[PDB]
């Protein structure tokens, strides 16, 4: 009954606005420039500008799928559907999808498996890819400012009759009082080191609910200024 | 011939604003954060600065503040272009020396009208 704060809801609302505003600024400026500069655009720059509109729409779409997904989990209307899948291609696929966002922030993205591939499991591939994408995303968003060796790595292993996925970064880390709260809806660490980073605080609550729907768990280990390890255990 | 220092942490944003500035024949120097911007002022003196607020390393409020602490700078006009939509954010930027505050999303044509007015 103590769960949540209405003030957290007010901050959330403001945060959605902020996160959607960025891609919309690009869409509107790029579209209006094209409209007013037809005689002043060469063809490769015209196509470049249209590709920014499209790619910024796709980012915005993703942000809208996060809100939806959350409302669905919230109202327990999202039922998972499992099948055998190879997590080695799953993880490589997710690393692939994140390369652009990552190089835009000079973050290198790796994948090591402690166990030979394929690592096969009975999971919802779409829902688990979404888990991996929120962790990789986070590893980029919360990476160090000004560092030449910034990274997020996915490490895969088979433990406890289950698969164990670690996503390690050398980013800003999470203060100890915050580790207990990061998985909660609307929670974001508020510091001078996260001021310009956009988000809603929905990512890890969605991840956690998805992991739990598989009968798995997710936990965190972090050192302020060293970085973080998110551990996802799912049964096989 | 006229030189604009364009300061924003989004490469996507810089590209589109630089495109519209060069359409006018202006020269553009980019800074990715506010500290990089202040370091660029040692190479040159721009006729105008276009300044974001939210940036890692050094924000725009801090930029504006330090711009008022050197005398060569304290007179370069500054147009703040920002996702920060509050009246109080605007008041603060103006009080810190910004000549004009425009909020993102922005019209590229209105923005260039205002850039011109500050350069004339
Ligand atoms: N890899 C990480 N390193 C440091 N902080 C992190 C990392 N991942 C998540 N966080 C913190 O946990 C918070 C909640 O994460 P998430 O639920 O993905 O929300 P958002 O990314 O929208 O804030 C983030 O705001 C950030 O403070
Ligand atoms: Mg910014």
Author numbering:
A (entry chain A): 243 to 478
B (entry chain C): 2 to 121
Sentences from the paper on this structure:
Crystals at each pH diffracted X-rays at good resolution (~2.0 to 2.85 Å) and all of them contained, in the asymmetric unit, a symmetric dimer of HK853 bound to two molecules of RR468. The overall structure of the complex at each pH was similar to the previous structure of HK853−RR4685.6 and HK853−RR4685.0 complexes, respectively and as expected, ADP and BeF3− were present at the active centers of HK853 and RR468, respectively. A close inspection of His260 in the HK–RRpHs structures showed the presence of the inactive gauche− rotamer, as observed in the low pH HK853−RR4685.0 structure, independently of the pH used for crystallization different from the trans rotamer observed in the HK853−RR4685.6 structure. Our structural data on HK853–RR468 complexes at different pH do not support this model since gauche− rotamers are observed independently of the pH, even at neutral pH 7.5 where the pH-gated model favored the trans rotamer. To check the correlation between pH and the relative HK–RR disposition we superposed the HK–RRpHs with the phosphatase-non-competent HK853–RR4685.0 and the phosphatase-competent HK853–RR4685.6 structures. This comparison revealed that all the structures, independently of the pH, showed higher similarity with the phosphatase-competent HK853–RR4685.6 than with HK853–RR4685.0 (RMSD values ~0.7 vs. ~2.0 Å for the superposition of ~707 residues, respectively). In the HK–RRpHs structures the DHp helix α1 and CA domains in HK853 adopt an identical conformation to HK853–RR4685.6 and the two molecules of RR468 are also placed close to the DHp domain as in HK853–RR4685.6 structure with no inter-domain rearrangements.
TCS are composed of two main players, a sensor protein called histidine kinase (HK) and an effector protein called response regulator (RR). The HK catalytic core is comprised of an ATP-binding domain (CA domain) and a phosphoacceptor domain containing the phosphorylatable His residue (DHp domain).
